[PDB]
Amino acid sequence: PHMFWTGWGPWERCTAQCGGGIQARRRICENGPDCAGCNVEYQSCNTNPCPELKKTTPWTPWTPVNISDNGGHYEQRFRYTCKARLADPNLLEVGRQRIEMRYCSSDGTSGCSTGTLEVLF
Amino acid sequence: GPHMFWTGWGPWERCTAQCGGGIQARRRICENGPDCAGCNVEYQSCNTNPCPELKKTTPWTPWTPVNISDNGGHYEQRFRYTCKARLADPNLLEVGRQRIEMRYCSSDGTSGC
Ligand SMILES: *[C@H]1O[C@H](CO)[C@@H](O)[C@H](O)[C@@H]1O
Ligand SMILES: *[C@H]1O[C@H](CO)[C@@H](O)[C@H](O)[C@@H]1O
Ligand SMILES: *[C@H]1O[C@H](CO)[C@@H](O)[C@H](O)[C@@H]1O
Ligand SMILES: *[C@H]1O[C@H](CO)[C@@H](O)[C@H](O)[C@@H]1O
């Protein structure tokens, strides 16, 4: 009896979800053990770039943007998005909020420009 | 004829990732073949330790009053955040666009202030 290879099996699972991985398919040498050639073959898979994953920062608190409520006032809040090219959303995180505080007075020096013109009304 | 044999395995080549898991190959050559028994290449995983947390800061939000000042002065505040990702390359981490919402607060309750 001469040695022979079984037919190639299916391509198995890819090592990466995206950004490039490899996968294998296999076969068996019968009546061997030393058939010519190799019992496993590899190819690349999922070579497309990973998608952009997004996470939003918390909103800042609603605060006035005007220092007077003459007939009402406007309020605003802000937020950003954090983005990364990843396969796992657990690897992207929004870090700790930082806050700064200053006091604005009439004859002040903290560098405020908000209600300067209100004195003229 | 001439004796057919495999050269010794070369060294493992460069890992496809520096962290978070990649693959690397090593190779050998069938001499006086070409039908050597076995494989001319092998692959293994490498650099499976987690990538470091790389960080980028958002821009500061605008300085805004804390509340409507009944007295002469008022406090103002602003904020910023950090974006973090486990990566080797900081270019793959980005701070996105700033979103701004605005409402008008008056005597009625039509805007939820
Ligand atoms: C299996 O590998 C190839 C066929 O795919 C040949 O060298 C031979 O048939 C071997 O048994
Ligand atoms: C597997 O590889 C190809 C088929 O994809 C052929 O050379 C043969 O069928 C082998 O078993
Ligand atoms: C090379 O591969 C193995 C040794 O590592 C054997 O099947 C044989 O020596 C071949 O030439
Ligand atoms: C490479 O693989 C092992 C050594 O790592 C042995 O089977 C032989 O030295 C081959 O060339």
Curated annotation (Swiss-Prot), chain A:
Glycosylation (residues): N66
Location of the protein in the cell: Membrane
Annotated TSP type-1 domain residues: 2-51, 56-114
Disulfide bonds: C14-C45, C18-C50, C29-C35
Subunit comment: Binds PLXNB3.
Protein task: Bifunctional axonal guidance cue regulated by sulfated proteoglycans; attractive effects result from interactions with heparan sulfate proteoglycans (HSPGs), while the inhibitory effects depend on interactions with chondroitin sulfate proteoglycans (CSPGs). Ligand for receptor PLXNB3. In glioma cells, SEMA5A stimulation of PLXNB3 results in the disassembly of F-actin stress fibers, disruption of focal adhesions and cellular collapse as well as inhibition of cell migration and invasion through ARHGDIA-mediated inactivation of RAC1.
Entry similarity comment: Belongs to the semaphorin family.
Identification of the protein by name: Semaphorin-5A
